[PDB]
Amino acid sequence: YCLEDALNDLFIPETTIETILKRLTIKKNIILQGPPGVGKTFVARRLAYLLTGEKAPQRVNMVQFHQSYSYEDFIQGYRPNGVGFRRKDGIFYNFCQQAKEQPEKKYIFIIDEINRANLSKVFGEVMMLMEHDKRGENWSVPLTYSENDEERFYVPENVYIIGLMNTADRSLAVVDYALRRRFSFIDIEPGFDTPQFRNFLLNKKAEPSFVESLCQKMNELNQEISKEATILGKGFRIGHSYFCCGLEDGTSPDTQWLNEIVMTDIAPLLEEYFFDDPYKQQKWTNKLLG
Amino acid sequence: LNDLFIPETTIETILKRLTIKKNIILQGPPGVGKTFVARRLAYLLTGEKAPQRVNMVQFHQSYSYEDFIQGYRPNGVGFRRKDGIFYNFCQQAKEQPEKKYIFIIDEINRANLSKVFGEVMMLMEHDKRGENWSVPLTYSENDEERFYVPENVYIIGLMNTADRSLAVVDYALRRRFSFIDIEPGFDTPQFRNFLLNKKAEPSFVESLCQKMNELNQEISKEATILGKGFRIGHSYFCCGLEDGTSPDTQWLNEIVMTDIAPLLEEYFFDDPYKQQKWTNKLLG
Amino acid sequence: ALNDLFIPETTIETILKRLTIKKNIILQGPPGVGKTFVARRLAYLLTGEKAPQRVNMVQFHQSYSYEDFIQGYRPNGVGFRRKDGIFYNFCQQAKEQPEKKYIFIIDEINRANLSKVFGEVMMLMEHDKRGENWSVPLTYSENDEERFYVPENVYIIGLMNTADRSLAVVDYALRRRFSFIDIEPGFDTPQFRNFLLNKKAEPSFVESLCQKMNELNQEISKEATILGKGFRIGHSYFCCGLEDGTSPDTQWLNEIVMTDIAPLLEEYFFDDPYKQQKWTNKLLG
Amino acid sequence: YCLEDALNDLFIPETTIETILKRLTIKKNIILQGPPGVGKTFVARRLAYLLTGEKAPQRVNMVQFHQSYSYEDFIQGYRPNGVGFRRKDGIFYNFCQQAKEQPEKKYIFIIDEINRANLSKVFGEVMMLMEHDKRGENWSVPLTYSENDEERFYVPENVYIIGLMNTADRSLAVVDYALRRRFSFIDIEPGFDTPQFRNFLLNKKAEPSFVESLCQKMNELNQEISKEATILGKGFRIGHSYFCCGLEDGTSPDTQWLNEIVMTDIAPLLEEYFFDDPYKQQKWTNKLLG
Amino acid sequence: YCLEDALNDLFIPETTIETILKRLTIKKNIILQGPPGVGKTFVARRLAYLLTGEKAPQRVNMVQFHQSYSYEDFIQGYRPNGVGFRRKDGIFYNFCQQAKEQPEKKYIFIIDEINRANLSKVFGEVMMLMEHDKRGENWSVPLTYSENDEERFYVPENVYIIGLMNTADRSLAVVDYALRRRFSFIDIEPGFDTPQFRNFLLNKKAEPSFVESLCQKMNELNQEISKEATILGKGFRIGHSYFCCGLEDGTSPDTQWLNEIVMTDIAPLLEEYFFDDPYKQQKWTNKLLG
Amino acid sequence: QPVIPVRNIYYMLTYAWGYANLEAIPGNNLLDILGYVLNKGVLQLSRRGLELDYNPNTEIIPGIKGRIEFAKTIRGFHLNHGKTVSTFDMLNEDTLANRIIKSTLAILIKHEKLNSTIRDEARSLYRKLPGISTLHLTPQHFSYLNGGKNTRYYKFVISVCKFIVNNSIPGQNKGHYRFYDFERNEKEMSLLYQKFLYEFCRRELTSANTTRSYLKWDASSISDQSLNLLPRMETDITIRSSEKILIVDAKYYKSIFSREKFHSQNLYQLMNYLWSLKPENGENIGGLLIYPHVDTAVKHRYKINGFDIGLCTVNLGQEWPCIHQELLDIFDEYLK
Ligand SMILES: Nc1nc2c(ncn2[C@@H]2O[C@H](COP(=O)(O)OP(=O)(O)NP(=O)(O)O)[C@@H](O)[C@H]2O)c(=O)[nH]1
Ligand SMILES: Nc1nc2c(ncn2[C@@H]2O[C@H](COP(=O)(O)OP(=O)(O)NP(=O)(O)O)[C@@H](O)[C@H]2O)c(=O)[nH]1
Ligand SMILES: Nc1nc2c(ncn2[C@@H]2O[C@H](COP(=O)(O)OP(=O)(O)NP(=O)(O)O)[C@@H](O)[C@H]2O)c(=O)[nH]1
Ligand SMILES: Nc1nc2c(ncn2[C@@H]2O[C@H](COP(=O)(O)OP(=O)(O)O)[C@@H](O)[C@H]2O)c(=O)[nH]1
Ligand SMILES: Nc1nc2c(ncn2[C@@H]2O[C@H](COP(=O)(O)OP(=O)(O)O)[C@@H](O)[C@H]2O)c(=O)[nH]1
Ligand SMILES: [Mg+2]
Ligand SMILES: [Mg+2]
Ligand SMILES: [Mg+2]
């Protein structure tokens, strides 16, 4: 793999990507926080191939957390093999053994929708181990279900963790401040006002006037969302993905195409963000169309 | 496309959105034929009236990820990993990629949707379908064995707008789902033509639309408490007239006390007078 | 059977118009209304053959679960076996006889979580989705060889009671699939007076008593919040003890006032003894 | 092993370190409460070598409580064997037997993130027995899953226990006051004020003005944190671990490095800390940068 | 076994201990209800040897309750063998069996921290037998796990039951119904304003004036605790055992020694108690120092 | 028997709790105002999302969910009927904080004297929270939440909920409720006022430092060093600045609303606070008496015993911003 191969279609600036790779080599644990629809899932699989420098998926593991995920599933736990129960090496446990075999090559574990699952319960033993300065055999720990003190588990240095956490829900947030320290938090913006996003549109036989008008529209709206931080922070603001996909057929991005999507997706979204104000709903909806 | 009481435009809108987006939510009050729409619609997209391809379920608060996808559950001998319906269903379509296999989810609002779907909440997206996007499941014994949505799968969600729960609002799921509202359709001639094609009075059918709309507008009048989502559906009128009993005002009198009155109670809570008024207004 | 029932014939006719079409029904009323005795006579009425075998009855409680109702794993002498529940066993009996209507009685339904008990099946019992078309494999049905469908012949009756103020609003699940019917106590009805005049009751004693109960049942329902129409007293206490062989009399009534209504009245109000004592004495004279 | 080797790199004052041993040797069970990043995990491994007087891991044991630890896991529980269950002695019971193998040499058991688990549930019988007075054969007690033949477990006198409860998560705090009497609580400060912290930076190619600039701002900020108690209490104040690490490569500490820290980790932490007005974020962020 | 050896060291008045001995001979089921650090566990071992009149371990048995404690372990239950399930007589069952041989000699069972586990789950059926009137073979019952109705178990009258409960938690506001009927609560005072507590210090080279100034403060402090009812009742008040410990070397009492105890035990407890009012912590914490 | 307009009272409560347009509501009485905040306040939360706290649950299920507890499984023989004793984490909104809201709303609906529209909206929300369990509320429930894990926003409505519960009395009917006549009682109104200023001054008077100062008597007694018998003396507020220190004692008296003799009995406390307090800095020592009046504000100065003392008033019922203007003007003059 190579860097520019990824960057061709990527809307985020390279500086952030450079900032990301700068921290990740250091911290080895990161969290990318932004609203849905900005390519968190998109970049993350690409980024692994950059950091290793090789397009090897065997060294990459990708999972999505949720409420029904626990330490028994993740790391280790007793589960039924059949008539007889056995201790089951969890997914992260298995991944780490692979990384030990090849210390040189970087091994990456990708966690989507991290904020849902009860992280303190899930990581547990890992919550201490994953820190960049505490990795290695010197800080080896016996596990909960380890047979004896001698059976111990240590995170290797090569491991890099990538976490994806949406900013839409205040209910589900990483309030665990101790855990917040382990992860280096990288905000991501919708990136409407970028040339690379516009170049993709113009590449898809798009009107330059319509493009710049569109970017201005959302940029103003996004700032309006960011304004009322008491009710809705900048984390709620609309992503670029609604507009991205759907042109694969070859349909030119006319106003009609935009008028359709707004009715189907953005219109109720505005209703929920602004439950009390109907005028504000009509105001912003009509503003995009006119 | 013949007996449907909903405009042809909306279904034409739906068919394009469904083919492109691959996931949709049909949201409206109960009794508008959301089930029959999707069930009709599923047969259209397949091109054949094939029920084996189509599967329908009705979520409920206790429904869980253990039931849906994967889970550890007992056989006669002991416990085993039991592949839930959706994994079994996607595997079935995985055998036959060409045909379009459909999964319908009713009363979606009730359950904690994130919990149930879990892993597939990412995988379900139209672009992220294939082995490249496969992931090992929570209970998967080995990381190498993974689950991926095939391209043929299309999912349709039927949502009741009458029980808003101020517990969990997810705007990320809304990103996956393209939301489509459904109106009752009293005004539509197609609903009216059915009754006039059942030897109804021209005034009686026309009078009904006047009656319900006045009620419906009142329900959608107070946006804060209630909305168009609460307003009354039509399907109650569909059933019960295929026996051979043609419409009459006496027939209307049965349904109002029978069916509509509890709905009114729910909506117009602790306001007997307004129930008495609007109920009696329909009788007039 | 018609004359033996104390409620209006109009409601009795109305139900059959409802149940036959809707196929799912729930009766909500005060305790002591003969909900159990009503349903059986109503169940026998629909079939026309007065068969108890066709009818099966269940009483719900919070512990009641899907394993008891439908299917579950029970210990064998060694190991365990799949054990068919009532409803799974019940309908397959009715599956053989499509023409024959089979009835299921679920008492005190509101106490339990309907979802937990039914599980999958809660959609299949909605009348529109019945028969082979709506087949589903069950949770514990390891193979896909056989699927469970509730046939059209089945009718499901639910006995609920509005007695308790502790009860909050009914679960949303019920409201969709069930048609709610409220039953009056039926004191005013002639059929109840003809059951007491048949026992040589004085019409004055009858009319006074009908006048006596009506004033209380009106008063208990006068309260907006704590005591509603659902609270008001039923007639079942009057049945048992007259046709056994003992004639009606004021002392016989006086015994009944002490028996149930006097403690029952205390629980409903639960605040003022004089209010109870006034009404308790008022019943006596 | 000696104090000079241990306290060579530690940023903590000598004052607490001896005070720690004052409370420990008499009481034998202690808890160190401080915000994350003050070396709680860091010192605890070192302290064990002082009391034994040697750099030995054998007499030391380290574990972390992950809200799924149980009395079956810590002390005595049942584990499946191939087809049928067996009774397995937990880790502490296994640890104590070695500790009483030789009473002369002291044994240390360290529990990180101790606050999380429901300690009354986990310890069970031990909650009384851990205390210094109630040790030895005199207070021998039979366990739950002990054999019918009387076999009793007593906390040996040589054993020392150390606990590490971070002060950020309020909910996860000891409210079993009966248990809080067994332990002695040692507050640990952020460690900014110390010159030993300052000496570390100057030794790593740092300006005293920039160094003294840094220390000045944090302590003011911690007062702003300490000022409130409703939401952000005294304990929330920021640790020094962030600044410690990442400089081994040779990057000198400067506003460029400081700027990376501020935007990347701390500033996200701050917006979650306040989450009422951004201006409070804008103020304190800019103050650090200036 | 002379009372003088037993009762001299004790801080509790001779009135309360004697009253305790009354109900214990009378009812034989007793609960000592007081906050930690007043010697609840301390006295209870002494009372057994007092009543028996001898130092004999066999006639006295001790346990601490916790959530995992159950009927199957306490009384009777099945423990797995390699495959098979074998019944095992539990402690209390085995304990009475020893007591049955010697009905004349008093036998004692000590249950610490009884409230933590619900008695019904453990005792269950035996709460019928446990009560003072319904004891003896007359009320004999066959157990749940008895193979046949023939074998029966009765609590002989000789056994006395002692229960130690701490009033430090909000959950205990709803005292368990099972305990109140069958056990008789007795309150253990903190016992600062006592001669023997004072006399303990005076013997250990303590200034008399320093002692009395302290007791007035603690008695004043506990008065503030008890006045509240919403958060902290009278039962939350401080015990007398923080100060007892740490003088075994012979180090003289002084304000210096007091400060270590205050800062390491009582102040953070007060932070836990008086979370809402930092100044109240400052008010009392500094008050002791003066 | 004149009292404050009810709308103004809400502002001081806000400062008391430390965290708007009320022109919209037409019900002047307090409970109409207070409910509208709560009823709307909950709606603000739901938009962002209510708190979901993982409650671990140990229950008997027919399969593996989370962590199996081997002991209870074998002891109860649940393997035989295909069940396990397992610990897992259901995610609920059924926490104590959220339960209080619904239970509080029940009393809100039950209140006899209330705007119908408010009751209409509340009954809607009461239905909209089905999963959460009703409760019979006590102060101990609020007490358990003093830890305050919850957000800054949640603590606001709960503080509102605390006011309602404590100030709720059953009325005509056994079930229904009737609101307390809060304004009529002086002690709580005064205790509001004393607390109102302390939190208020921290906001606006950033220039000065605001502290409540505990004092020790200058007395010595041969009998006792403790002086427990002596009254406990804690200032209401002290507002210290480098140039001048200043103490305020403020209380609500009924007599003062009548414009005659004057009730200044609290003043007797003040001098002794000045006396026992000794400043090392020796910049200055000042005192203030401030009371609430309805019509008008009058300011006086005094030089009594080497102390500089002011009596001043505020015309509550005027307007909140102009009232806010007046206070900043007031403290500025005397502080200087
Ligand atoms: N072609 C293209 N698509 C992009 C780009 N960035 C984001 N997208 C698209 O946006 C969609 C979602 O990507 P994703 O990472 O899942 O967004 P997200 O923020 O993680 N969503 P969520 O948080 O809900 O999981 C995909 O269609 C993805 O390809 C981009 O730079 N180029
Ligand atoms: N060199 C040196 N590093 C220190 C010192 N104090 C803390 N650190 C460093 O700060 C980082 C974290 O320390 P740590 O013990 O884990 O803090 P913690 O309180 O245990 N972390 P947490 O509360 O999150 O569990 C490590 O790099 C640690 O070495 C110190 O005095 N000297
Ligand atoms: N010398 C002496 N020590 C006492 C006296 N009372 C209590 N202590 C000491 O206080 C310490 C703890 O007593 P203990 O009974 O365990 O208190 P507890 O109520 O059991 N504690 P908890 O409630 O936490 O379980 C022991 O050192 C005990 O000897 C006393 O009167 N004299
Ligand atoms: N012909 C016709 N029948 C309809 C229409 N809508 C609903 N029905 C019928 O109404 C009955 C009940 O529909 P149902 O799915 O239960 O209502 P819903 O789920 O609340 O939308 C079925 O017979 C439907 O096919 C319609 O638009 N046209
Ligand atoms: N003969 C006769 N008995 C009735 C009638 N209605 C109720 N009963 C009697 O009342 C009793 C049942 O009352 P019921 O309310 O169901 O008891 P509950 O279920 O505990 O509330 C039986 O004795 C019934 O036979 C009736 O109409 N005719
Ligand atoms: Mg995504
Ligand atoms: Mg640490
Ligand atoms: Mg004890």
Residue numbers in the entry:
A (entry chain C), D (entry chain B), E (entry chain A): 168 to 457
B (entry chain D): 174 to 457
C (entry chain E): 173 to 457
F (entry chain M): 3 to 21, 28 to 267, 272 to 348
Authors' own words:
McrBC is an antiphage defense system of Escherichia coli that specifically cleaves invading DNA that are methylated. Furthermore, upon binding of the endonuclease McrC, a higher oligomeric form—tetradecamers of 12 McrB and 2 McrC protomers—is formed. GTP hydrolysis by McrBC bound to a recognition sequence powers DNA translocation, and convergence of two such complexes on the DNA results in nucleolytic cleavage. Here we present the structure of the AAA+ domain of McrB in complex with McrC at 3.6 Å resolution using cryo-electron microscopy (cryo-EM), which reveals the coupling between the endonuclease and the motor and the mechanism of activation of the GTPase.
